[PDB]
Nucleic acid binder design. Structure first.
Ligand SMILES: Nc1ncnc2c1ncn2[C@@H]1O[C@H](COP(=O)(O)OP(=O)(O)O)[C@@H](O)[C@H]1O
Ligand code: ALF
Ligand SMILES: [Zn+2]
Length: 683
RNA sequence: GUCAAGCCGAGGAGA
RNA sequence: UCUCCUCGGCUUGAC
């Protein structure tokens, strides 16, 4: 029951036979269908050729793999060929390399494949080789770039093509290369002011893929334009003259502390540059071993955060955020006391805070000066849903997660949204961060299905949503004051697959966001022109340029290796001393340390044992200092109750000359630690 | 079916 | 070089 459209056939017509190429079309144009048709066509040809038919599909996003398998690939081609869909969530009970020769149609996230190849290179596993496949297919190719995943693969394929070309003039024998396909919407630009630079960027993309041409549709192009609708754009701006009662109270607190510090930011409060200054000051303070400065740097940073959320989010959210933090600090102090101890700074800060904290709590619940951009957002939602009369499938984007969760709660709480019957759910990535609850991959998938069901007419999400999530109908899409690049803008702007679609943006009049909007708009215009230039490029000249770029990429890789051969070759097990960071309290040396899984660094001596504290919530306990610094988390490996930690929380002190430093992660530093022989700790 | 923790890589933004 | 955010992956464990 497979189908096709005219332009679809037109654009793909070359690839139907050889011609490893790219395809560039607007969103929701049946790209997936194009791929599917090509898969079937490709295999049928291999079968009639009595030749092996293997295919593989690649998606950067995990959600996307399931999507394609669920809705497009598995349905049509189920009967003819075997199919299967893999992801981190999926369990490869078999293995990757085996199924490569089992289901004959693979769908996978990228890094899975690369992981397999890399293992093959190591010899640790049988792994897999490109030759095993006959056709490699890709989505969102635009990602292919400097150190992008896809690029890691292509650089291999390119290398082999170069070998094949070398043989072409030396020896008849060669190694087969699978046909490569490319599927995207906006190949994008590398922030090129000049369209010629953009042209170059494209050429780089194509060469990173052995694209013989962009091959965008021209003849039926009008038909496609007619078929496909573009949302009615809409800008929404809001100036923040309010927040004087509450925000200003905060700025007052910040200044009070800075006065406690005698440190001049020379930067506006609530800004990243201000935050960055806080960090470097904190780093310097800690490296110096000095206090009263790094600690305050920490708190101020917390407050700049609180400001930025208070800018977007209401006073309540930020106040709560500060309150949680200080609550944690108090609990640490109490655990330490559990003896007698006193502090001057912390006492200054907590007595500075707790009372003003009550004040801000009182100031927190105010509807009038709650926000401006949030309100505008409400107005847009309420208007559109009221206007749709049950015909609204809504999406939202932001930058962070804490944002998403807050919005979903506040929207559900708001009677106005409740009145219209809108239902809000927040979506995020699997990993846990930003002090938010992680979502199980299944939970995300469930949520997606519920929206596809319409159970949720308003799904909050993050960049993860910007891609894929092919939905039959969506009328509404917005952006909550977030500008990253033209590509993200267009993909998101191309997600309301409805005859009538609305694109909205919400920005502070003060922030130069609409600026960047216009930027990306120009880039969008620039690229289509650049594409038209190359499409008219000479084949041979095109060929020469791409070859040059292919080589360039590879040699670049070689040097990035050369500077990475070792680049920090210290075999110095214990030539150091780790102190606490808040307090300059010695903790351990390098010798008392060992490793498990060659990943986790730990010490397991009673000397380190009788120093920390376990703050409760129960198995995975958290660790803290006697100063109140947090140190690490418990760990139960093979029964051993080893407490593991994070290097970032501690500070370096060499034996030689003590140029104290921070590394933020173990791998960065040169020296090695050993694994732990469990011969120890026996009877 | 549930949860936690940790490590690594990559991209984007800003500086 | 630093920072923030985001994504992907790999391990350990417990329930
Ligand atoms: N032959 C066809 N005729 C009509 N509609 C089609 C055809 N093939 C695909 N589509 C439509 O295209 C949509 C899928 O678009 P897709 O290519 O996945 O989005 P994108 O191009 O942004 O990745 C489906 O909802 C389907 O309705
Ligand atoms: F391939 Al698309 F939006 F164009 F997922
Ligand atoms: Zn300490």
């Amino acid at each position: 029951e497979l189908q096709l459209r005219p332009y679809q056939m037109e654009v793909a017509q070359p690839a139907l036979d050889g011609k490893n190429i790219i395809i560039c079309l607007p969103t929701g144009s049946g790209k997936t269908r194009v791929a599917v048709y090509i898969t079937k066509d490709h295999l049928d040809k291999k079968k009639q050729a009595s030749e092996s038919g293997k295919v593989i599909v690649l998606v950067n996003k995990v959600m996307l793999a399931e999507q394609l398998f669920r809705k497009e690939f598995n349905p049509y081609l189920k009967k003819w060929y075997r199919i299967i869909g893999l992801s981190g969530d999926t369990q490869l009970k078999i293995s990757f390399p085996e199924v490569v020769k089992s289901y004959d149609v693979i769908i996978s996230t990228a890094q899975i494949l690369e992981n397999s190849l890399l293992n093959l290179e190591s010899g640790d596993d049988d792994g897999v080789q490109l030759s095993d496949f006959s056709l490699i297919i890709i989505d969102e190719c635009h990602h292919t770039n400097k150190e992008a995943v896809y690029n890691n693969i292509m650089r291999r394929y390119l290398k082999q093509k170069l070998r094949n070309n070398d043989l072409k003039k030396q020896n008849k024998p060669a190694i087969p290369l699978p046909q490569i396909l490319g599927l995207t919407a906006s190949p994008g630009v590398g922030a090129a002011k000049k369209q010629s630079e953009a042209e170059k960027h494209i050429l780089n993309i194509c060469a990173n893929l052995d694209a013989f041409t962009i091959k965008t549709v021209k003849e039926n192009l009008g038909q496609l334009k007619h078929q496909i609708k573009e949302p009615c754009k809409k800008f929404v701006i809001a100036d923040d003259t309010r927040e004087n009662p509450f925000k200003e109270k905060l700025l007052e607190i910040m200044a009070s502390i800075q006065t406690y510090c005698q440190k001049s930011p020379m930067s506006d409060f609530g800004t990243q540059h201000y935050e960055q200054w806080a960090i470097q000051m904190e780093k310097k303070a800690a490296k110096d071993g000095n206090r009263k400065d790094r600690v305050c740097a920490e708190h101020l940073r917390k407050y700049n955060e609180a400001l930025q959320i208070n800018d977007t989010i209401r006073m309540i959210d930020a106040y709560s955020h500060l309150e949680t933090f200080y609550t944690d600090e108090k609990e640490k102090k109490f655990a330490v006391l559990n003896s007698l101890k006193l502090d001057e700074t912390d006492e200054f800060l907590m007595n500075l805070f707790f009372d003003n904290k009550k004040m801000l709590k009182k100031l927190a619940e105010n509807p009038k000066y709650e926000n401006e951009k949030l309100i505008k957002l409400r107005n847009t939602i309420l208007e559109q849903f009221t206007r749709s009369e049950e015909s609204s499938r809504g999406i939202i984007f932001t930058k962070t997660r804490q944002s998403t969760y807050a919005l979903s709660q506040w929207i559900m709480e708001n009677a106005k949204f409740a009145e219209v019957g809108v239902k809000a759910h927040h979506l995020i990535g699997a990993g846990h961060s930003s002090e938010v609850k992680p979502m199980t991959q299944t939970e995300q998938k469930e949520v997606i299905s519920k929206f596809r069901t319409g159970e949720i007419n308003l799904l909050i999400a993050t960049t993860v949503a910007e891609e894929g999530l092919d939905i039959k109908e969506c009328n509404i899409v917005i952006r909550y004051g977030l500008v990253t690049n033209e590509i993200a803008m267009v993909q998101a702007r191309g997600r309301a697959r409805a005859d009538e679609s609305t694109y909205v943006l919400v920005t502070s009049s003060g922030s130069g966001v609409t600026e960047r909007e216009i930027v990306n708009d120009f880039r969008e215009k620039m690229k289509y022109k650049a594409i038209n230039r190359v499409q008219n490029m000479k084949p041979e000249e095109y060929a020469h340029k791409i070859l040059e770029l292919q080589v360039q990429s590879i040699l670049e890789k070689k040097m990035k290796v050369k500077r990475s051969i070792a680049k920090q070759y210290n075999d110095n097990p214990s030539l150091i001393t780790l102190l606490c960071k808040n307090c300059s309290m010695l903790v351990c040396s390098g010798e008392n340390i060992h490793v498990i899984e060659k990943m986790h660094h730990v010490n397991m001596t009673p000397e380190f044992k009788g120093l920390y504290i376990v703050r409760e919530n129960q198995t995975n306990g958290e660790i803290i200092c006697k100063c109140g610094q947090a140190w690490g988390t418990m760990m139960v490996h093979k029964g051993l109750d080893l407490p593991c930690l994070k290097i970032r929380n501690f500070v370096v002190n060499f034996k030689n000359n003590s140029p104290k430093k921070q590394y933020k992660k173990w791998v960065e530093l040169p020296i090695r630690f050993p694994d732990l022989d469990y011969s120890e700790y026996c009877l």
